């Protein structure tokens with residue numbers, strides 16, 4: 329019974345994922361691996377190609393509406409911020425499409441998103457990343473890791489750790505059906521500070537985790553220790569976000585000309 333019930337639950341979360349996220353890992357890898365297609369991403373690897381891309385690629389956030397221009401490294405950071413906020417919106421709609429998340433009182437929904445979205449973002453980031461760079465502009469561009477490394481501190485430093493995580497995470501070869509459960513588990517997390525109904529979120533979390541371990545025995549029958557490995561990645565993501573927040577505190581302190589989106593301010597407010 330348990331195995332069957334959890335299979336149904338996993339399908340419902342997968343559908344939530346497919347309904348709400350702009351890009352799947354399946355579509356991202358097909359673009360990254362240069363699979364047969366009539367278009368390839370424009371490669372952004374330096375100042376000239378960045379400029380060409382702001383001229384020639386289609387961006388969800390129009391450039392005129394980014395904060396006023398400061399310099400190349402900051403401009404890149406503003407593009408990072410734009411896409412981060414866009415992903416928070418997707419994650420919010422994904423979570424809302426899970427009935428046991430929507431049943432929670434709205435204040436607990438906010439607390440879970442507040443403390444979970446960055447972990448979920450850096451996990452789902454891996455889907456559009458390879459060792460050489462990442463997709464941007466809905467897959468119409470590819471920004472090289474080497475170019476991101478070339479930006480001045482503090483902006484290069486806040487980027488490279490996410491590549492290090494992503495390449496290791498991609499070696500586990502999760503697909504979108506795995507990620508739907510993994511991200512649902514990240515968000516529905518009973519450990520978040522200030523939660524009102526902890527036992528309820530703990531129970532949901534546990535249900536998602538049992539669903540996940542069964543999902544992996546079916547979908548990845550030959551992959552030994554894959555479930556405990558993913559529990560460790562959940563732990564790892566907390567540390568990655570702790571780091572990230574500390575780096576953001578330093579950008580707020582030392583980069584006073586750099587504009588920080590007010591939603592992200594509300595997220596770091598307490599951390």
Ligand SMILES: CC(C)N(Cc1ccccc1OCCCCCC(=O)O)C(=O)c1ccc(-c2ccsc2)cc1
Pocket residue numbers: 372378404405407408409411412415449450453462464471486487488490491576592
């Ligand atoms: C949401 C993900 C995570 N990112 C950002 C990102 C990726 C990898 C490492 C770090 C990143 O952002 C750290 C700062 C985040 C500040 C917002 C905040 O306070 O969280 C991106 O999708 C992204 C988007 C656009 C570009 C780009 C465009 C033109 S040239 C480069 C590069 C990356």
Ligand SMILES: CCCCCCCO[C@@H]1O[C@H](CO)[C@@H](O)[C@H](O)[C@H]1O
Pocket residue numbers: 416420438441442591594595597598
């Ligand atoms: C869209 C989901 C993402 C939500 C982002 C984080 C929300 O921040 C928090 O919102 C609360 C009001 O609801 C305040 O009481 C907190 O002080 C503030 O930190």
